[PDB]
């Protein structure tokens, strides 16, 4: 029972994904406590034209004014469900859409995305199905624990320079000043709430969005939403050819998917200042790669996704909260499927059964 990833199995036309639509929206605070309201959105703010150029210290404030969120707590999809419980009658497609659906975190499928161009790092995914849905839940490889735990300094103030960044571009107000003098928090998050479809798969998931663009001219979301980046400065054009191999398609692969139309990436140079600003669209990030026999290709990737959501709704047979086919991949290889029962991999909340049964 496995499932192959090589790229050129995946190569056909490219699938059906329907226009992602909003169903809602939930807050996490400063103390990472859930509100189920928009409070936590920030508002694209970038360097009025007509003035200075982007000039942003990302080192500023790293650690002092670092409140990072504490990444030994697994929250899984516990916010997710608790905004499923609270939206469970009103939700679209009338009677029994969730029944149909796969319910996960935009991060879950972002990464079933890129796994056929995926060298580097392998990853867990759990699964469960409960009242006929798949529920698709993250597990951290023992690899990606220690070197979370061993993280070098140098990487842990080049995050920090990443969440550092939108506190330049984004403003609390619309049309607001950014304000890079308080802190950095991490547990601060805003998440939209989409639904979609690919192929035969509907999908319930959620993702954390960076800012609003009021300026926008489309007021209807996840349409109006901004993705932020960072990345090296770059200087000859096999740089360029790297990051557009590499990089661009993990941008792809996160935009996409919720249907954010832009990323807005800030070149850093090696002393931490960003003092360059650039827009990629999400539908042309693949034009730079489209004639690169080294490049990507997002037909691979969303075939793929479907091919593993398939090979999962086939696998999960049983509707059982307590027992979890956990699906394994390590690049080069298959993915590859074990079945574990309650501790530690079970992952659905007696809270959210209960409720769900009742
Ligand atoms: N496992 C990880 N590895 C590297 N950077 C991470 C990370 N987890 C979070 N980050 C940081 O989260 C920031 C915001 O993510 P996002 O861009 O997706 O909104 C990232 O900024 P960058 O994306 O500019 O690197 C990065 O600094
Ligand atoms: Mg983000
Ligand atoms: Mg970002």
Request: aromatic share 12%; glycine share 8%; hydrophobic share 35%.
């Amino acid at each position: 029972p496995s499932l192959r990833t090589q790229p050129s199995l995946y190569s056909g036309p490219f699938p059906f994904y329907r226009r992602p639509s909003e169903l809602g929206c939930f807050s996490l605070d400063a103390q990472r406590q859930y509100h189920g309201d928009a409070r936590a959105l920030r508002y694209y703010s970038p360097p009025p034209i007509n003035g200075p150029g982007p000039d942003f210290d990302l080192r500023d404030g790293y650690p002092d004014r670092y409140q990072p969120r504490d990444e030994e707590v697994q929250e899984r999809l516990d916010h997710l469900l608790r905004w499923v419980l609270e939206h469970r009658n009103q939700l679209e497609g009338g009677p029994g859409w969730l029944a149909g659906a796969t319910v996960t975190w935009r991060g879950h499928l972002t990464k079933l995305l890129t796994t056929p161009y995926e060298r580097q790092e392998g990853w867990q995914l759990a699964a469960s199905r409960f009242q006929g849905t798949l529920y698709l839940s993250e597990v951290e490889t023992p690899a990606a624990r220690a070197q979370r735990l061993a993280r070098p300094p140098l990487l842990r103030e080049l995050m920090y320079m990443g969440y550092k960044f939108e506190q330049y571009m984004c403003a609390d107000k619309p049309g607001g000043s950014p304000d890079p003098s308080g802190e950095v928090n991490t547990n601060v998050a805003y998440c939209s709430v989409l639904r979609s479809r690919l192929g035969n798969h509907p999908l319930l998931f959620s993702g954390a969005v960076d800012c609003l663009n009021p300026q926008a001219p489309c007021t209807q979301p996840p349409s109006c939403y901004v993705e932020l980046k960072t990345s090296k400065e770059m200087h000859s054009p096999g740089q360029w050819r790297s990051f557009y191999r590499h990089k661009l398609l993990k941008w792809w692969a996160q935009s996409f998917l919720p249907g954010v139309p832009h990323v807005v990436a800030g070149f850093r140079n090696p002393e931490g200042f960003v003092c360059s600003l650039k827009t990629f669209p999400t539908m042309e990030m693949f034009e730079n790669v489209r004639n690169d026999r080294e490049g990507w290709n997002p037909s691979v990737c969303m075939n793929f996704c479907a091919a593993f959501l398939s090979f999962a709704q086939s696998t999960v047979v049983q509707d059982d909260p307590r027992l979890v086919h956990l699906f394994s991949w390590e690049p080069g290889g298959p993915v590859t499927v074990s079945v574990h029962r309650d501790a530690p991999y079970a992952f659905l909340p007696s809270w959210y059964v209960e409720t769900m049964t009742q």
